[PDB]
Design a protein around this ligand. Structure first.
Ligand SMILES: *[C@@H]1O[C@H](CO[C@@H]2O[C@@H](C)[C@@H](O)[C@@H](O)[C@@H]2O)[C@@H](O[C@@H]2O[C@H](CO)[C@@H](O[C@@H]3O[C@H](CO)[C@@H](O)[C@H](O)[C@@H]3O)[C@H](O)[C@H]2NC(C)=O)[C@H](O)[C@H]1NC(C)=O
Lengths: 439, 52
């Protein structure tokens, strides 16, 4: 028997679905999502890291003029400074006083730290969905890890569960993703080869192992101070270091729908978005004929207390006459009321207790137990607590979902005005009919 | 390698209508942040350097 149901894409909240196969005792399955993971396909564009500026010992040509060659190094500059008269600890470097030239050169390359400290610029595409689902099947708790792309059936005590596809394609990740360590950012990083000095992407490399480095650091060689051999320069400080200080909050803290973010692999977890269809294939061997199952008659529902709190603050007591001892499925016939128990044990002439949660001011609902329905009704009171640490176990209310007395007052007022209009309309019609009758 | 970091003291929490009131007791500057769990997270954050 194939059963298709849909549950809200929430985590930590159980949902109950009724499997109704006429001629057989009904089954109620309680399904709870424990984890939902969206894992985006990533394509690395480039990585960034702190650069080091390499400055080879300066060449001082005494009593002559030095010249430099162009090089292909990532960000290379060379300059020859004339009129240099450098000193060493033991005295002037060389014989000539003014006829001296110094050749300064430098290039930018990835530091050794880039193997550990780097950010990866990824292109994000579609995401593969997977989920961990808790299923209460015939009184037993089975946890199944399965893909949620609608293409994976996982067996629960010989029943097959197919999860997904998810109804929402929404992801917390934008097309451009930058990953540092455990932190993922939605940053619109520059194209490779289009970096800017002092900004993220000032130094870029396609892969961690690549020798191919793009750099734009504005490295400018300056003239050395008199009497010295040092090589001064003006360069924009690593944009990686600046970025690390200016990162701001990561998606783990800023994402919509309460999404949790993790890396290695990049994952969006437990996003409260849309809903998730589940298809369940239950073998005939799992069904018990109604003639073998317990059957209840002479049922009556009374609700001694009701609070419309997020938790199961409502309690209902239902009288029953059971034909035989055994377990019996319990189902709510209305979306407005959630029942905590999936099944109860019943025998003889007695009463059963069930707990429920509703947002209704007036709880009017039916309960089906072993294919026998009862009608429950109660006046529910508000909670005194303002805040809780858990999500509601009940659905939200529609505009039509109002208290019994509120409906009565609306009918009295609406009827009162409608009556006045109906009377005025009647008088006008009668007068017009008289006016038409007269010539 | 893995570094050890402190955990700020539990806040004193009281409740009002659609409101959570926290009294914070930092030893050192501590980042506080919060988000809505719906469509518009309205993320906000501040550093707390004293009881607030
Ligand atoms: C099927 O599983 C549900 C949910 O519990 C899940 O399975 C458990 C074995 C654990 O691994 C859980 O971490 C996991 O979520 C069971 O319902 C849960 O039962 C436990 C008791 O076993 C309830 O905890 C109690 O809660 C009260 C009130 O706070 C405390 O006073 C108690 O000290 C104790 O902590 C838990 O609240 C309840 N959860 C729900 C949603 O009802 C269920 O009983 C189990 N069924 C079977 C046949 O195993």
């Amino acid at each position: 028997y194939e059963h298709v149901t849909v549950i809200p894409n929430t985590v930590g909240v159980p949902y109950k679905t009724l499997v109704n196969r006429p001629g057989y005792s009904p089954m109620v399955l309680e399904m709870e999502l424990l984890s939902v993971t969206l894992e985006p396909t990533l394509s690395l564009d480039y990585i960034t890291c702190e650069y080091k500026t390499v400055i080879p010992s300066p060449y001082v040509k005494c009593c002559g003029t030095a010249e430099c060659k162009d090089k292909s190094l990532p960000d290379y500059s060379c300059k020859v400074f004339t009129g240099v008269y450098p000193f060493m600890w033991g005295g002037a470097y060389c014989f000539c006083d003014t006829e001296n030239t110094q050749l300064s050169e430098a290039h930018v390359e990835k530091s050794e730290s880039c193997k550990t400290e780097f950010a990866s610029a990824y292109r994000a595409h579609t995401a593969s969905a997977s989920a961990k689902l808790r299923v209460l099947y015939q009184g037993n708790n089975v946890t199944v890890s399965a893909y949620a792309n609608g293409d994976h059936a996982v067996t629960v005590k010989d029943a097959k569960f197919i999860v997904g596809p998810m109804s929402s394609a929404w992801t917390p990740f934008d097309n451009k993703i930058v990953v540092y360590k455990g932190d993922v950012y939605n940053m619109d990083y520059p194209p490779f080869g289009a970096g800017r000095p002092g900004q993220f992407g000032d130094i870029q490399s396609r892969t961690p192992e690549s020798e191919d480095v793009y750099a734009n650091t504005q490295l400018v060689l300056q003239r050395p101070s008199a009497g010295t051999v040092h090589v001064p320069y003006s360069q924009a400080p690593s944009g990686f270091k600046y970025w690390l200080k200016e990162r701001g909050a990561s998606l783990q803290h800023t994402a919509p729908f309460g999404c949790q973010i993790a890396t290695n692999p990049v994952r969006a977890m437990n996003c409260a978005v849309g809903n998730m269809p589940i298809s369940i294939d239950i073998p005939d061997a799992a069904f018990t004929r109604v003639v073998d199952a317990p059957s209840l008659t002479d049922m009556s529902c009374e609700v001694p207390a009701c609070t419309h709190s997020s938790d199961f603050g409502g309690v209902a007591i239902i009288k029953y006459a059971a034909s035989k001892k055994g377990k019996c499925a319990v189902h709510s016939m209305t979306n407005a009321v959630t029942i905590r128990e999936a099944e109860i044990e019943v025998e003889g002439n007695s009463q059963l207790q069930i707990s429920f949660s509703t947002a209704l001011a007036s709880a009017e609902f039916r309960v089906q137990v072993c294919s026998t329905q009862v009608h429950c009704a109660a006046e529910c009171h508000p909670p005194k607590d303002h805040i809780v640490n858990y999500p509601a176990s009940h659905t939200t209310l529609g505009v039509q979902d109002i208290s019994v007395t509120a409906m009565s007052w609306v009918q009295k007022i609406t009827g009162g005005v409608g009556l006045v209009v109906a009377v005025a309309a009647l008088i006008l019609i009668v007068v017009l009919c008289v006016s038409f009758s007269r010539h | 390698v893995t570094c050890r970091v402190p955990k700020a003291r539990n806040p004193t929490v009281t409740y009002g209508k659609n409101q959570v009131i926290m009294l914070l007791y930092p030893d050192h500057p501590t980042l506080l942040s919060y988000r809505n769990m719906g469509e518009e997270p309205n993320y906000q954050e501040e550093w707390v350097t004293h009881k607030k």
